[PDB]
Structures are given as C-alpha cells and as structure tokens.
Design a binder for this molecule. Structure first.
Ligand SMILES: N#Cc1cc([N+](=O)[O-])ccc1O
Length: 250
C-alpha cells in the first residue's frame, strides 16, 4: 500500500519540547495546534511521546489525547511510560488510535496481547530500539540505557507472534545524527515480519526517506527535521512521488 510520513512530537506538561519554527502558528509550542497544522499540510499520522513527571503524567497525557482527538481527523499514536493495560486502555478510550510501548513490552510481552485482545492488533505499536553490539543487532530498553541481550531478530518475531500491529524500528546508532535512516537495519528486519515497519532515527534530508522506503519501510517517522523546517512535508511528498514512491497527496 501507500508509504506514510509520520510526524513525532516530544511533549512535556502539554508543551512541544523545543517547539517549532512555524511562525504562522499562534503558539508554535502548542502540540495541538502544531499537530493540527501538520494534518492540514499532508502528514499521514501523528505520534506523541510524553516525558511529563510522574505525579502529573497520567492526567497530562489524558488531557493531551482528548484535545488532540477533537482537532485532528488523521490517526495518532501516544506513548511514553505506558507500562500496563489500564494506562493503555484509558488513553485509547479518551481518544488515541494507537499506543506505543517499548520497555514494558520487553519486560512483559503478554502486555502486547492484553492490549490487542480488547483494542485489536492495529491499536498496538511496539517501538524497538536497536543497536549494533559486537556485530549483532541487540534490543535496548530504558531510553537506550540497558542492553537486554535479546537479539533484534528474535524480538521482532516474538512481537508479531504476541499480536502487535506495527513496529517502529529505532536505530540508536542514528538517533539525533541527521546522517540517514539505518537502511541496513531496516533491510535486516524486513524479511522477519509481515507487520508494517516504521523507520525512526537519522532523518536529515528528503533523499533519506526514499532510501528508507527502498529498504522496505512502510512509514518513516521524523521529529526536529520537520519542526525546525529543514524538510517541508509538501516538498517531501512531491519528491517521493516524483521518484516512484506511492505516497498520498492529501
Ligand atoms: N514515537 C516515538 C518515540 C519513541 C521513543 N522511544 O520509545 O524511546 C523515543 C522518541 C520518540 O519520538
């Protein structure tokens, strides 16, 4: 099917961490207004990652999803510290289409199945953070702090078996570098799963997205290259379409 461009917003206390360069916005740090604007210029989905302190986090994330769902019509995912079914459930019911889990899934893979049994596989996005270690792709948890010793290859297969709907494949080797998506890692994972693969980490220019889709990604997730306007969403989709990639032009 079509390839998808997904804008990722890191949020804290209801604000976009580090804001954006869209001077047309009344508040370029408002994640609702920014998300709405992205939906109007051709982003396919949104992804919110919350890093609010724990005393206010639960209510803060629920307020976010409720305000977002009112304003946008495209799918969105919420994540950041979702550790159990009840937390995932309250966020979906309040408006999110999908939840994104990582550390809690690795520690308890049945969490994937629990959420999927009530909300469907299509509501469960597993973020897999992976890095090369001694020549093998290994899975990392706790914001990259912990080498689990689980092979990427084995965790991909288990994630699909447990009922996840999509995988975000984040390359710790590329996060924050603007040097390109980790196409070798994407090509490594592609034959191991039938699920949609969302590339994350390393985006710096339009050609990087073409490369990631040639590697077999179904979607590409990007952050500051969009918010700081190093890449324009409408230029990006026109570029991808020109070179043969099936993207939706609204
Ligand atoms: N979506 C997302 C996302 C997830 C993680 N993460 O699961 O560490 C980090 C940054 C992100 O933008």
């Amino acid at each position: 099917l079509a390839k998808r461009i997904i804008a990722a917003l890191i949020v804290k206390d209801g604000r976009v961490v580090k804001g954006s360069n869209f001077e047309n916005l009344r508040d370029s740090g408002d994640p609702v207004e920014l998300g709405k604007f992205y939906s109007e210029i051709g982003i396919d989905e949104l992804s919110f990652w919350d890093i609010t302190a724990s005393v206010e986090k639960r209510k803060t994330m629920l307020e976010l999803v409720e305000k977002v769902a009112e304003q946008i019509d495209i799918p969105f995912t919420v994540g950041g510290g979702i550790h159990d079914f009840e937390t995932a459930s309250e966020l979906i019911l309040r408006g999110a289409d999908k939840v994104e889990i990582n550390t809690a899934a690795v520690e308890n893979p049945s969490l994937i199945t629990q959420i999927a049994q009530t909300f469907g596989s299509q509501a469960v996005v597993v973020y897999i953070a992976a890095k090369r270690v001694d020549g093998e792709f290994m899975v990392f948890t706790y914001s990259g702090k912990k080498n689990t010793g689980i092979l990427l290859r084995d965790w991909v297969v288990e994630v699909e078996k447990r009922g996840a709907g999509e995988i975000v494949l984040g390359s710790i080797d590329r996060l924050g570098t603007k040097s390109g998506y980790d196409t070798e890692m994407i090509r490594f994972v592609r034959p191991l799963t039938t699920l949609p693969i969302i590339a994350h980490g390393g985006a710096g220019k339009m050609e990087h997205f073409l490369e990631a889709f040639l590697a077999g990604a179904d979607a590409a997730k990007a952050n500051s290259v969009l918010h700081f306007r190093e890449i324009d969403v409408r230029e990006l989709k026109e570029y991808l379409k020109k070179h043969g990639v099936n993207v939706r032009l609204e």
